[PDB]
C-alpha cells in the first residue's frame, strides 16, 4: 500500500505529472496552502493547510507558514495517510509550503510507522541565494524526518536539459525527474522487507537515471545511470542499492541481466543490491535504468 504526497506547488506539479503519466499502483495526495493550486491538482485527495493562518490562500512563500500550517492540520494529514505502508513525500525546497510543511508531513508518516521516503528538489542556484538558504534548512529538516532522502539539485538538471529550455519550464523536467525517482521505487512494489532494509533509517540517498533506445540500449542506459549528473558521488560508497529497469514489450531478459551486471560492478564488492524489471507497454523502444543508492 503506497501513497505519494505532493507537498507544495512544486510537489503538486510533480504529482500531476505522475498522474498524467500512466501510474496505476499508487494513491495520490495533494497538500498546499494555496487553494488555487489545489483546484488545478489532478490528485484524488487534496488537503488545504493553514485554513486559519492563510484564510484559504497559499502560504505566500515563507517556511514558517507551512510548518505551523501543517501542525494545524496534523489531524487531517494523519487521516489521509492511515494504513499506508510506504509514503513518498515529494516537494520543492526553497518555497514556503514545502520547506516547512513537507518535513512535518514526513515525520507524521514516520511516527505512524509507514516507510517514509523523501524525494525533494533543491532550487536552482540561479534562483537567488536566499531561496537556496531556506532550502538548505528544509533539506536538513527532512533528513531528520525521513528514512531515506533523495535530494535532486535542480542545477544538475542544467547538465540534462537544453540551454534553450526556459527557466520557468525547466521545472517540467524536474517534475519528470521526481516522477522517475518515486515511480522507479513504487513500480517495483521484490520483497517489501528487502526494500525496507534498503530504505529504513538510511538517510541520504543518491539517484541515477539513464535512458537509451539504440543498438546497445541496455549497456548504454546502465552506463548513463551509473554516472548520472544527479549522483553527487559515484555509487561505490553505498551499502544498499535499488535498481529499476523499465522497458517496453521488447525488453529482453538478456538486457536486464546486462544492465544489472553493469550496475553491480559499479557498486561496492559486497553491496546489498536489489533490482527488478518492469514491462511498461507505453514505452516505445527506450529503456530506463534508475539507480537508488543508500547509506552515507
Ligand atoms: N518539480 C517542480 N519543481 C518546482 C516547480 N515549480 C517550482 N519548483 C521548485 O520548487 C521550489 C518551491 O516552489 P513551490 O512549490 O512553488 O513552493 P511552495 O508552494 O511554497 O511549496 C522552487 O525553489 C522551485 O525550484 C514545478 O512545477 N515542478
Residue numbers in the entry: 13 to 201, 209 to 315
List sentences quoted exactly from the publication behind this structure.
FtsZ is an ancient, filament-forming, tubulin-like GTPase protein found in the vast majority of bacteria and archaea, where it acts as a central component of the cell division machinery (1–3). Here, using X-ray crystallography of Staphylococcus aureus FtsZ (SaFtsZ), we reveal how an FtsZ can adopt two functionally distinct conformations, open and closed. The closed form is found within several crystal forms of two nonpolymerizing SaFtsZ mutants and corresponds to many previous FtsZ structures from other organisms. We argue that FtsZ’s conformational switch is polymerization-associated, driven by the formation of the longitudinal intersubunit interfaces along the filament.
Specifically, two SaFtsZ mutations, F138A and T66W, were designed to inhibit SaFtsZ filament formation on the basis of equivalent mutations inhibiting the assembly of Methanocaldococcus jannaschii FtsZ (M164A and T92W, respectively; polymerization inhibition of T92W [unpublished data]). Both mutation sites are located on the “top” surface of FtsZ, in the N-terminal GTP-binding domain, and are part of the longitudinal protofilament interface seen in crystals. For easier reference, the five SaFtsZ structures are named herein in the form #XXx: number (1 to 5), mutation (F for F138A, T for T66W), monomer conformation (O for open, C for closed), and finally the arrangement of monomers within the crystal (m for monomeric, f for filamentous, single protofilament and s for split/domain swapped). The conformational switch does not appear to involve structural changes around the phosphate-binding region of the nucleotide-binding pocket. We know that our mutations compromise filament formation, and we obtained crystals where these mutant SaFtsZ proteins adopt the closed conformation and fail to form bona fide interfaces. Hence, we propose that these closed forms correspond to the conformation of monomeric SaFtsZ in solution. The fact that the phosphate end of the interface is not formed in any of the F138A closed-form crystals supports the idea that it is the closed conformation that is not compatible with the formation of bona fide interfaces, not the mutation per se—because the F138A mutation is within the pseudointerface.
